[PDB]
Structure 1
Amino acid sequence: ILTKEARSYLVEKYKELRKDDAQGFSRSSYRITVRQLESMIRLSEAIARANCVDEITPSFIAEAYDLLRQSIIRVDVDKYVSMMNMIVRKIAEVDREGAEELTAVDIVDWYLLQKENDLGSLAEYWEERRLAFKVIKRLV
């Protein structure tokens, strides 16, 4: 049984786990689901069973943690922010599944194709178009 307040640490560990795994979504996610937070518990207690230690250690927690991590990696293989997110998203995917390069216009092309779903009004389209264009013009 872990009464120990080093459990607090576990939170940030849970917290450390999902953040880097939020973007991209093209990573191994999952989510990472809260059920995984819930999983880290039974894992911890498991390692406690292993080592006979009671109230465990933050270290054993880190072991269960890294374990889940490799189990994840094996699965891997505002305006400007949204556009910069597009840049990082496209590159991060294409670097892992390709070199990335090619026609810069295409990036705007498929970008408009994706954001067209979020467009509430024509002003949102026009803004997104002129922003992505502004970023590319600034970038070059």
Structure 2
Amino acid sequence: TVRQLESMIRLSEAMARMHCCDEVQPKHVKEAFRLLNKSIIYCRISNLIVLHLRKVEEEEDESALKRSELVNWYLKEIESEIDSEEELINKKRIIEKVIHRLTH
């Protein structure tokens, strides 16, 4: 109720406390949102993929192919956040495995 809602605001306020961020950001409040769902309890890798593509395929005003012959179109909105090292060769053969869930 109200006693638990005021505690969630403090979690988002203290989330950007170590990152040296002044104003709060929407990407920091959703971090504690997942802990509230799993509070009463390689599968974690498959969770951050479904929750990411759902927020992208809901803003295109048009629709092209990007079905079977254009499997590399779904890699554009995800390579922007990639800025490490091993997420280019090792994770290259992993993209074709997650997309197989819709094919079957």
TM (normalized to structure 1)?
0.35
Higher relative contact order (CA 8 A, sep 6+): 1
Larger radius of gyration: 1
Q: Which is richer in helix?
A: 1
